[PDB]
From Swiss-Prot:
Name of the featured protein: Carbonic anhydrase 2
Cofactors (names): Zn(2+); Co(2+)
EC number: 4.2.1.1, 4.2.1.69
Site (Fine-tunes the proton-transfer properties of H-64): Y5, N60, K65
Function: Catalyzes the reversible hydration of carbon dioxide. Can also hydrate cyanamide to urea. Stimulates the chloride-bicarbonate exchange activity of SLC26A6. Essential for bone resorption and osteoclast differentiation. Involved in the regulation of fluid secretion into the anterior chamber of the eye. Contributes to intracellular pH regulation in the duodenal upper villous epithelium during proton-coupled peptide absorption.
A GO biological process held by the record: carbon dioxide transport
Residues annotated to bind substrate: T196, T197
Organism taxonomic ancestry: Eukaryota, Metazoa, Chordata, Craniata, Vertebrata
Effect annotated for changing H62A: Reduced CO(2) hydrase activity, rescued by 4-methylimidazole (4-MI). Reduced proton transfer. Enhanced proton transfer. Enhanced proton transfer capacity
Pfam families assigned: Carb_anhydrase
Effect of H117 to D/N/Q: Reduced activity
Major localization listed first in the record, in broad terms: cytoplasm
Effect seen on changing N60L: Reduced activity
Amino acid sequence: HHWGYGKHNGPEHWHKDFPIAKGERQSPVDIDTHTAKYDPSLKPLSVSYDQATSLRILNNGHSFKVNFDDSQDKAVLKGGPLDGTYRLTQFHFHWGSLDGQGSEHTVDKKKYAAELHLVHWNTKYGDASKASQQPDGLAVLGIFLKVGSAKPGLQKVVDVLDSIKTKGKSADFTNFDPRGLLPESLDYWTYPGSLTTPPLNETVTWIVLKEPISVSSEQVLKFRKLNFNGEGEPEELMVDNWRPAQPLKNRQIKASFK
Ligand code: NA
Ligand code: NA
Ligand code: NA
Ligand SMILES: [Zn+2]
């Protein structure tokens, strides 16, 4: 009886195995754009992805994930709310059964069709496992997806999904450039939060970009052909793999822009 997104194992059940699910710094949250305070001292955000080296893509039964070779000082996030340097290790997505839902964060209660999470670890902790345990160990760059015009840089991802349809499948996935997934603006909101999947560790600085990327209906439809199940099991489409907004509790969301 593994955690998932269904009626009997979904987000409302997670707290039994992972009591931190009811903690003080859980993610995602609704971003109240009127309450968020512009912070004129945030340093400029620096997203330096030109030497990123992708390795493999996987269906883990909960999302699809592209892992990067993070053994060297390449693809890094710094500045903004962050102290030091955070190294990209993987990205994955959350998406809906319909275009009107799928994101984890919301903006004034608005749900986007999907959300991209680029996950980075603080290099002061040596690798991602140790970093994942520290209160300032991880930084996730979150990017909303809306349905409209195609995102050309997503197409190479979309086209490999047929090869990882079911849980447990993986494939080599080299030379993917995550710069092709970024919007024009780096305007963002930031707050202290958690992983949005078990174990829900409260170790993430969230940086959520204001500007969504547009992807086509056809691109997101291909996400929805993935399966939660393993090969040979009854087909359950991988859709609505998003955790809803959690209580903000005492937290402040800061804006990088006026
Ligand atoms: Na990792
Ligand atoms: Na853009
Ligand atoms: Na769900
Ligand atoms: Zn995620």
